[PDB]
Nucleic acid binder design. Structure first.
Lengths: 121, 121, 215, 113, 50
RNA sequence: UUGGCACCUCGAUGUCGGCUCAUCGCAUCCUGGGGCUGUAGUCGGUCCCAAGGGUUGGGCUGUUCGCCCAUUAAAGCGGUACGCGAGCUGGGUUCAGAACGUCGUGAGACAGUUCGGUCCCUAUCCGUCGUGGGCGUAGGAAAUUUGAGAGGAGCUGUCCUUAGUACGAGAGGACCGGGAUGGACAUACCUCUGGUGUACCAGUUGUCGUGCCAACGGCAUAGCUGGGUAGCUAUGUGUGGACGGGAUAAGUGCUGAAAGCAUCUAAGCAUGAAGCCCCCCUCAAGAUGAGAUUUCCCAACUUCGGUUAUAAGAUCCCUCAAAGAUGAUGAGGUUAAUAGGUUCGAGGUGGAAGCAUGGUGACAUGUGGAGCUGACGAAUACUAAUCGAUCGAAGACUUAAU
């Protein structure tokens, strides 16, 4: 691996799946410096599967994404697998990498760690 | 064969069937022997009817090892068994027959009678 | 008598005259230029300064070592050349056979020369006494509470101190080591690569000095 | 895949041997200089593994001589193999057939394709 | 291993020579007008320009 | 060593053997050099100089000690709280239980024996091993270096030739020379042989879930099993203790007198050891005695008899690993390949999903060496190293020469 983030092997990969899913549902989250440095690889590799749009690519993405429901506006409820292959994948058909960005904020109270903003470009 | 307690079986025509290594010759502090090295051993198992009897201390030479040896061409040869031949004072077999394959590295040494009787060298 | 500077690429193997296997390492020595000459009258000893890898030009907004600075440009302009990032002196060579600004080709050596190689070993960090000094462990069972610690460090109130040179945990690696009596297997032209029989200290992309054996 | 390494080890590569996979019967013709006369010795068996590489790629062949297992390993491009035959091609489910070291008799046979 | 002797206040002040903190390393933000951390956003308006 | 005395310690200096780590002496076990011999040769005995290096694994016994087995060039003797328990153990001895022999009227004791029986401590100072800041080195910086000193290494066997020669009735059998190859030890490295490889590939068991069939996901040591990239490794792969100078020790001499002879010595000149100093490897100018070489920058305001910032150069901050506890070191910061992403490869695994075909069925075949792939090699500014800030010199006095 790259870095362990003070977690066991089984529970580290479960946290990365939750972080990747949340960055698709809301497209903008705030978290720790170290965690966001490695969510880039997970999220950006997942959009690559979405652009291909194959059945083998869709089943290879269903083993990383969680099961949630999208409901923000008045339209029909949608999943997270459907959103990635239907909305995100159509905004990067002409882009080669660099689907995410990181912006630093500063140290937070009570912990001393710095928070950052990661979002889809 | 390697250590001071390894159990070696024999492939010659003598009363001995299994021997236990006692000393590796060829220097002070030497703790490992290979194919073509003389050792001091004792006869732990013997067959009814033969020249060598149980409990006798005899000399022997190593003809097969599981670890194997490396040649100058970069090739290796390994065996599935560890074997030895009881020799006489003038580097000659005490028995009259040799069983199984024998390593080719005895040919370059002075053990020529062992190679001659060996079914395959 | 003769020597060059180069980088370490990696290890490989080639077959010999009678089919034997020879493990060799690949060393790339290119862009070597004589930069200065030292004499007894001026300095007190005879040697030559040799640069290995050239840098870029001077920059007003430079912030890293990729671009040579102002004092490093004037040293490489005394003789027509480019500013280099490695400079070493060779003291075993003859001054009368070299000129200032002269190229040092890879063809100085031939297949069959006996050479020695010096470099900086790989660093291992802060290590214990077992790895750093090759000491023996204590029992791992039988009620033992002594596995990897160092043993006694002194004797008693007679000598109420520790002698200098005691083996203690510390940082290991990163030392300058010379390997003597190595064999040149093949010198390759149009690619500037020397094949050295054996191995050299240091990791990949390191700097190695090659010289003729003094013994 | 360093370009400098791939160049100095280009003339050492030889293209005369056929393609084979572990599990097939193979014949090796090895020259030996024992004594004073050079002759050819033939080695049969089954290719138990093929560890990959470039100039440093090797393969291992195992055979039973007189009830004792013997394994020989050679470099693929060594200048001591005159030619290589392939008698039959077997059907295996993996690459390293290390399980055959402990199986003897009818349990150590590989079905022909 | 208890201390053998009482530590004087001369040794204590010498030991704390390097026990200190420094300024964060702030720079002026040419949108807000007040200082901000380098490579970070302006807390008053959230402008990480450039 | 066993003793004699009772000078320090009873408001505490903790024993015997074993493990780990050593260090010192020479009254020398091996190796190097000599004299004598009742030294023919290969072997021996005794004495002299010499401390550089080396000096084994097991069986019995808590044992030191001793005997025995198998090797080796050799299996040396002593000091250091009979070295070392704030470095380890606790087999014996000095606790509380129980038994035997023996003594005692008895409670109980050994000139003895047997079974079992809590080993605490977060390092303040000196010492030792690594690694950073401040100041000095008469202007401020970047590289390359000399070596006053210090540390490291120092061992040795067996075969071939000389030569079956010298010697010897025969048995037997060489000095002085020339080669090959090992044992132990030290160092470097991962091409080969293996080990590990918890974000790689594959198979399989029970149970819950994605509504269901297929395809998958969580849990059960990483559920278990078979392989395995990079890094880190030995048992793996290379190298080393070489050839030589100067002065010596015990010895051996030349010439020569005191003493008309003889005599190595009083003057003079030689030769002579693994031992001393060089030679080989590493650190080293805080070496305050602070060294040398090659480049880089040189003014406005003053009368201040001095400041001032700026230049050369180095940092704050950010992207990293060949480096690393931190720090430091090294690769970069848009005029940019430093890291991530993307597209190609190396290596690893072993034939993906879907569909068609054969079979009632579990399953087998092609499409196709397919699909997937962490650390390894290239190309590519799509993302993030934005914008700025801080430190940083104008060269003191005396004498001599041009």
């Amino acid at each position: 691996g790259y870095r362990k983030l003070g977690r066991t092997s089984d529970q580290r990969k479960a946290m990365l799946r939750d972080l990747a899913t949340s960055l698709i549902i809301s497209e903008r989250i705030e978290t720790t410096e170290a965690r966001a440095k490695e969510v880039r690889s997970v999220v950006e590799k997942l959009i690559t599967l979405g652009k291909k749009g194959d059945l083998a690519s869709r089943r290879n993405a269903a083993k990383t994404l969680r099961n949630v429901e999208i409901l923000n506006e008045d339209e029909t409820t949608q999943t997270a697998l459907q959103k990635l292959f239907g909305e995100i994948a159509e905004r990067y058909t002409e882009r080669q990498g660099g689907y995410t960005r990181i912006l630093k904020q500063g140290p937070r109270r009570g912990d001393g760690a710095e928070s950052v903003i990661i979002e889809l470009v | 064969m390697i250590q001071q307690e390894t159990r070696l079986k024999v492939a010659d025509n003598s009363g001995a069937r299994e021997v236990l290594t006692i000393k590796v010759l060829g220097g002070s502090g030497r703790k490992t022997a290979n194919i073509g090295d003389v050792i001091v051993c004792t006869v732990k198992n013997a067959t009814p009817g033969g020249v060598v009897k149980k409990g006798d201390v005899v000399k022997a030479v190593i003809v097969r090892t599981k670890s194997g040896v490396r040649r100058n061409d970069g090739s290796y040869i390994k065996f599935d068994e560890n074997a030895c031949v009881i020799i006489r004072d003038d580097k000659g077999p005490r028995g009259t027959r040799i069983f199984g394959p024998v390593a080719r590295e005895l040919r370059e040494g002075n053990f020529m009678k062992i190679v001659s009787l060996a079914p395959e060298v | 008598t003769k020597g060059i500077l180069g980088r370490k690429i990696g290890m490989t193997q080639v077959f010999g005259e009678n089919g034997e296997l020879i493990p060799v390492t690949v060393v790339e020595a290119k862009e070597n230029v004589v930069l200065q000459k030292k004499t007894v009258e001026v300095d007190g000893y005879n040697a030559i300064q040799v640069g290995f890898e050239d840098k870029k030009a001077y920059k007003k907004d430079a912030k890293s070592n990729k671009y040579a600075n102002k004092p490093a440009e004037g040293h490489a302009k005394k003789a027509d050349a480019a500013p280099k990032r490695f400079i070493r002196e060779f003291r075993n060579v003859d001054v009368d056979a070299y000129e200032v600004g002269q190229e040092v080709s890879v063809d100085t050596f031939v297949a069959g020369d006996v050479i020695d190689v010096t470099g900086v070993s790989k660093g291992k960090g802060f290590q214990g006494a077992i790895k750093r000094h090759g000491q023996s462990r204590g029992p791992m069972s039988h009620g033992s509470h002594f596995h990897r610690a160092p043993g006694s460090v002194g004797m008693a109130s007679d000598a109420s101190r520790v002698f200098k040179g005691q083996k203690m945990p510390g940082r290991m690696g990163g030392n300058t080591v010379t390997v003597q009596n190595l064999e040149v297997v093949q010198v390759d032209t149009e690619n500037k690569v020397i094949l050295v029989k054996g191995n050299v200290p240091g990791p990949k992309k390191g700097l190695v000095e090659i010289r003729t054996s003094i013994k | 895949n360093h370009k400098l390494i791939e160049a100095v080890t280009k003339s050492q590569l030889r293209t005369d041997l056929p393609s084979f996979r572990p599990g097939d019967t193979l014949r090796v013709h090895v020259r030996i200089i024992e004594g004073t006369r050079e002759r050819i010795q033939v080695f049969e068996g089954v290719v138990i593994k093929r560890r990959g590489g470039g100039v440093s790629e090797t393969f291992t062949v195992r055979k039973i001589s007189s009830g004792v297992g013997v394994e020989r390993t050679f470099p693929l491009h060594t200048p001591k193999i005159e030619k290589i035959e392939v008698k039959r091609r077997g059907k295996v489910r993996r690459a390293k057939l290390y399980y055959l070291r402990s199986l003897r008799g009818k349990a150590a046979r590989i079905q022909e394709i | 291993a208890v201390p053998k002797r009482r530590t004087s206040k001369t040794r204590k002040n010498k030991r704390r020579t390097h026990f200190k903190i420094s300024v964060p390393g702030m720079t002026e933000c040419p949108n807000c007008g007040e200082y901000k951390l380098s490579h970070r956003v302006c807390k008053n308006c959230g402008s990480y320009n450039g």
